[model samples]
Target chain A: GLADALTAPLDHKDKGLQSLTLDQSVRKNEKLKLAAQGAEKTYGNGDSLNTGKLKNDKVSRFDFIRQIEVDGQLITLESGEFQVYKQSHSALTAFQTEQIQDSEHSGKMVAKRQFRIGDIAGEHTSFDKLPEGGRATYRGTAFGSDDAGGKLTYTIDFAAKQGNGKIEHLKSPELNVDLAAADIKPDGKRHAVISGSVLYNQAEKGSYSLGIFGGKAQEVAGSAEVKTVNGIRHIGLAAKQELE
Target chain B: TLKPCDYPDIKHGGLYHENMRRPYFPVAVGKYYSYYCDEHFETPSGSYWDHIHCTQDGWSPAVPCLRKCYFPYLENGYNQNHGRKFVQGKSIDVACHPGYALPKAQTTVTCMENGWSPTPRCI
Candidate 1:
């Protein structure tokens, strides 16, 4: 009798799998006031990311605000600090480039770049390459930043130019030779590279490359081997990446 | 009296070959050409130079590739010489470990080029 089918206390082929031993726990505290009644109503439309078309790319801005500390009494409302239209709206007001040609080569140079910004903007300098390419931008919205010690401020105006193939960005300039990524080192990380080329007011040619942003002033394009040969000088770095 | 003893950091854009001297030559790239040799100038691979002359630029000092390290082993029997020897101001001489057990008070091992300078470990 004690072995009939092991009687029913705990024996079961006597089951095609049916079991419930409830002690389940779940609680949804979504809204304290669930007056719960819906008839349906919705509509929405709007778009803006500061200024648009590449969404007004200034390295794709996002200066959000609304920092709080409630009872501790602290709040931050940074609308990028009263945004004076990002410093009186500057898109360079003017500057142009397009004599580019350096389609990549064993010597086929033709380049162009000009930047004359800020108070007496005068960039009539020239550049080219023939690995055949073309460009020079920042016609307006002339921009700049990092105005602190070690010093970085280019509301647009400084000189340096080179050209190669495939690199095309309309606004970018910050090369008086970036000191350790603008850390402005004088006593450290001295990996600075520009290796020589200057002629005052405009005979610029000394670049280190590896790229830049969208500030609309003067910037990078790269490669013509040892410079577009009018006397030559091409300090290298050909394939070096990752700094962002 | 032409002080500026060292010159090559021409804001980093024009050091176009100093020692190997290849810039437009006649002195350029913030200029660094001191000549007070008289004799003892032997160079090529013989290197023995005179009074004081340093100039080696020629572009691309993007500089940042050092810290070699390799010569440091003596835990009992292991300086099996792995090559590269270790660079960057090299210095290595912590003798006595031929097979262990010997005169301890300090012998050497602070090869500071980029690394190792404290109480290593071997006992």
Candidate 2:
């Protein structure tokens, strides 16, 4: 009665995929750990940035600093660079500051981002925006130009650190990418994002380096001792550079 | 075959998909398709379809799937309006895919040196 009667009309997904072992999305729920809090990096403006009080393990200073007030006015940007990532070997190089003014468009100058960090595989972003032209053009963002490069119009707010909880602001229409310079070097895991100011077309001769990497970011991160895609890396930087 | 949460690679709400498993993806109106049915031997009781979501006229109606349990979410990260799947583990109390969180205030992402151990920064 239980066998035949129950088998008469049972299509509960083919009687539970013939008694599942782990497929109803990895065997039912199986949650262990994730989302202990929101996306993270929520410091100042939203509050919780204490750069000086941080000493968990790594922070070789990196020559970092960020003020960002924007509107009422207050800007201080530096060390806008970090990332090495060599795939699973572990890497973390990052930055994001968009006050963009000129939108740089001539032959190239691109470095852009407005939402779209959901590529899957490893989720890459530290600096990427290239396929067309290029222009993340901005020195301080506003009229754009500062950090001594000089040039302003005013709009500001690039210190950013609030939207994180896995921040996925894409509904299928979020585009603004084109900030990756290529020399044909593709080993698979490589990316970099250093903010503010870049002209392009420089390369050897006078030493524009034209390779165009982070301007300061601690003079190119002299020593964190990455070695060869080392290990133990987790960088989001900007804990507290003195905020009120 | 594909272990590690079985990932069909569907993030849903924020839009992200790959291989999507299930005849090639479609039945989606509100998304959510987290799955993991492992434990066969004919009926070792392995049918754990986590949030099995999909509305507009399909899926969603399996209530208690099993294995870890955490299908109570909603707010863009999705789970409520007809959930689908969300599996994590090894000391799990996780929460930052709903817009992400955890920079301070009791953080625990331990799996131990192999990856998730101290790497649970979610933001």
Candidate 3:
């Protein structure tokens, strides 16, 4: 049907070739057929017949991002970022860990599960190696409390075998603690023991045994216990070393 | 007078000139040529090879072939494909599970040049 619709002859001599409009009462797949009589024109010369032209419109990352917001869409690595797009006739161009509860109300099936932009984009990378010299800063989201879970950062000086770290809770600032010039002891290959006290109160001592992971020492994650007024505040910190 | 149409521009595939030993290009009006698709490409009806007829002004069925964007795995949702593929310019319906919402409340996504539109995921 589509083939015949395109090939069927239509009145081309009417009022100069403006776009053809059919009927208003019925839905139509608009078709335009213009016939020209003149000299021999080359059609499929070179590789022209094998390729289609890409739209001249510069593809904006923000526009593309807004269009394809759903999941399960495939993506491509452009430069160093991931962009989701659709196939055309032309040419091909975070993690949230939490338990969700079902609602008891019989009202509606609400969308309680939330996702981070990074997780939906489905882009991930691995730390190849840790820096052999200079200092490295590791930053990532931290969870657990008397769980003052928020963010954690560890800056380590390899030459001096010294480091410092801090964990601040989103809801409880009192539970927040820091490691001031702690000793970084090599416990094993790709492993270290950080022994220090709470900067606010040295009596509230803590020790974090971190293990460097990845093919090299690109990441470090560890757990620690600190003496707090309530009790032992258990904390887990997983972070990636900033690459130089 | 009927103008001789030019050869069709086949993307993601090429014309099948090996079948004919004579002229590979469209020599005159009413002449027809065969075209083939690549691995992941095919006609809208799933044919690997199809014919294009030369018309008075251009090639018949402007695009004889298209690339197919296969169904991707849905994390917390279901896709209309069930177990099928969609050619370029085609759209598919999908739904998300309870507690998940399709971004912007749109449930249909069209297959484009690179991937599916709206990214079929329920946020």
Candidate 4:
């Protein structure tokens, strides 16, 4: 029954597809747990974000923890106490992306992107032509759950065909990472690829694949999957190039 | 006495006549010159270039350049900051579909160098 086949459950395809589904959901949970850890590392300390103390200091779901220099000593205050650079860490971190598919008799297409850290969404190109010379600099935010995310800054030399970048880890202030992606090969379309290894905390081995996107190479986005001592760690960034 | 305003340091802008030499002293009163801003910056009048006039109290336009931060069209939601002009360091409130929120649950978006700080989206 053709109609029955269309309405049938996915049991027939479950054997092979189950792993994929499991991986997608598992990755989502992993990211969620990481976000939760960020929250736990913050409010769980019970120092500033105590609900009893912050009840009157709630400013639209955000708690303000102010730091001030009082009586020749720098002391931390409570939610009702201070502001500026004292806002509590966010409670959640979420990713957004779309999954696209097309079906036809002879030639069909199905494109699915379960992760939001890569070039899956397109629109990385927007200029009429790429810059012929000079170096380009990009700055944006990095997204890493346990590593606690940070700021990403990168610069690439069009002539030298080389690039370097850095990530300032927010949670672990001293754990900043420096990257030298030596081989900058433009894909002749929308991106230039750079791959290299890195040394992070605890002598962990990490590798990254970064891309410079856009006609003038105004966009940069990529991910690094690291082999930590205990398990794997992941991080990604999407940045905009500064104007000349 | 009307004093020449110290070279007006416009955010996201520079003197249009970079090649032309600028006056050294008190920059003569009533003296004015043109300045241009980056691609995403504009004057209050929505022009990319404008003349900065040295006035008695201070610079003619207290705030010279305003960074243009655009609000992307939201599906199944409304943008309060849409079609509105914004200056750097200014923030605006927005509404999104339920179960969706701007980055980091931020209710407002602020104009920054690259664009909106939180980057408005109902993600």
Candidate 5:
């Protein structure tokens, strides 16, 4: 009788199903990483987003760095620290020489004056964008006090439908604007829509302003309403920040 | 002191109408006209008393859109007669088409006693 009881039919279906689900999850994560890597390669050092390369790319294969889910907010970094070619190397060289002269002059004025140049140079920093759709950049000069002041730039150029369409990279001049002024205002809320190229230049030792651009647009949608004919609307700028 | 009827027909481009609505006329005297859209309009407020125009929509026009006041002094019998006026000052301009140039005589207009005048043409 005991032998008959042990011989009862055993179902291994549940165990197999669980194994398959676990495998699928792992595969999904790998895919995301691959897609993110691909994006990084395509953009290279260009300031503009290469929509053509990213178009039709599935989110499942994109690996967003520092992926974190807090409450309901999902934060991720698509790329970081891509090299940008220096525009006018000669200009940069001259700027450095002037900085040296300023330092020497200040030192002779007073003992503490020597500290002035150090303070300014320590403030320089690079710029980058946050994951969702904003920039996190810094500025300051070498040997200066590292202040968190900097700038951020962004652009968006695409032609798409509801969740699908051909996206093109719009070639327009980079508009330079300062976000620091906007951030200091009460109830600071600035939002910009860029349809062309944009460049963000950070001051020396300015770490706080780096990478304040990039990320995702909030509440973007398509419309069908047709109205009067005006010229094509292209660029925009906006900002929002909380004072501590 | 002219009303909106005194101005020419306000023509809007595709992008302008998409961003702003039709602006009211005569605009407030001494106050700058705020067009809530992207379309451009001409106003009577400059030296040649030529119509001043601006687009209601777009980023370049949105910022630095504030009007600049000018007060020029004239030596009338050493009385130093001064007059107050407003002008459109430095603004970022975006060329919609290649080879197109600004209509104003100068790229910038400073307020003079008589009003602002156009800058020299570029194209």
Candidate 6:
């Protein structure tokens, strides 16, 4: 009965591909562009750490602390360190003695330091791998020589929040959350997971400055910072300090 | 000699019977009868009547005797052959073509004394 109702005599003059038109595909493309732009402006920009006050903090580090933040989510380490030691010595040999002193001192011997982020802060501290959060962790250390100046290694953790809110050091990795919604939850209420680690280097002469290259400054350094929400990855901020 | 009681008297065109003897008779036939009757005539022997006639003139014999005799036989044949067969009559199936239905009120066939009747169609 449906077949009978639907069948009709087609005009032979309008046959083949003529029955379908390119207009429909064009309309679909327009719709997709509009949707993508809307999604980018809505969930993409707000959750990004590169926008607004976070623009300068895009790189995962704070020059004031000479630290770098890594990991897609927030996490804690058992032990950590800040040292300027010989680059040739292995982790085992270098920890035996203070081969290099702190970068605060001026000397011809290039001081390469390794800094760890974890639960313990003193000497003979236990080291823990990166915990689950909106960021990640790394084991590789940063190197600074007398000829190469100084370097800093850091692990960044991020926690994103609603509206414009102040950032706080996450007390626990479990407290970090992701606010961005995924395809599974399109309502912009679900949290997404992001975590990773990256290592960067910087060379300087005397003092620390924001100059991209050659300068005389107090501390020639690199650093990282964590920005996340509900333990989800969104963006990373990293920067290098130059001495002029 | 003919007895007087045996003879019927005719009045006009109609016949009548009487028990009394007539007072006068024809001269010649009466003299002979008178002579035979005086000394007692010889008695006649018993005999069967040769012919019989109806009292009513021009009346014909009934013709329904033949039909009456044969009727019971005909009724018996109908009961044994046709009546019994119809009581246990069976139906013949008729189907309709695809996409079409049978017409209403003509669905079944019935057996009678002669043969099966025409089939009834479905609605």
DockQ of 6: 0.00
lDDT of 2 by residue, A1-244 (tens): 1122112343343221111111111112121111111222212222212222212213211112233332244333212221111111111222222311111111122232211011111222232322223222222100001111111111111233101101011121111111122121111233322221111132110000011123211111100100012211111211111112
- How well does candidate 1 score on lDDT at residue A81? 12
**Please, what are the lDDT tens digits per residue for candidate 1 over residues A1-244?**
1112111233333221111111000001100100102211111112101111111112222221212232243322111211111111111111122222122211122344321111111111121211122233222121223210111211111233332222112122222222111111111212111222322124333322212222331332111112223322221111111123
| Reference contacts reproduced by model 6 | 0.00
Residues A1-244 of candidate 3 have per-residue lDDT tens digits of 1122123344343221112122110012211121112211111111011111111111111111111111343221011111111112111111121221112211112232221111000011121233457887887644442232467788878677676887775465544667577655443232344444454444444434344444444455544445446544445455666555
Tens-digit lDDT track of model 4 for A13-46: 3221011111211111111111121232122111
Error of 5 at B2 (Å): 17
Number of the predicted model whose TM-score against the real structure is largest = 4
Provide the TM-score for each candidate, comma-separated.
0.22, 0.16, 0.30, 0.33, 0.15, 0.12
lDDT of 6 by residue, A84-185 (tens): 121111111011111221222211122333221101000111112212244322222232211112122222232321111111233333212221211111
Off by over 4 Å in 1: A1-55, A60-200, A203-205, A208-244, B1-106, B112-114, B117-119
DockQ of 3: 0.01
Q: What's the true lDDT of residue A119 in model 1?
A: 13
TM-score of chain B of each: 0.25, 0.20, 0.71, 0.72, 0.19, 0.19
Model 3, residue A119: C-alpha shift (Å): 46
Better of 4 and 5 by lDDT: 4
Ranking by TM-score: 4, 3, 1, 2, 5, 6
- Binned by DockQ into CAPRI classes (incorrect, acceptable, medium, high), candidate 1 is incorrect
Please give the TM-score of chain B in predicted model 4: 0.72
By lDDT rank, best first, the candidates go 4, 3, 1, 2, 5, 6
Provide C-alpha RMSD values for all models, in order: 26.8, 27.2, 28.5, 25.1, 26.6, 64.1
Task: Give candidate 2 regions above 4 Å deviation.
Answer: A1-47, A55-244, B1-123
TM-score of 4: 0.33
C-alpha positional error of residue A154 in candidate 5 after TM-score superposition, expressed in Å: 8.6
Across B1-123, the per-residue lDDT of candidate 6 in tens digits comes to 432222222211111001001221111111111000000011110000011112232111111011000001122112122111121144433343344333454544554223345522323
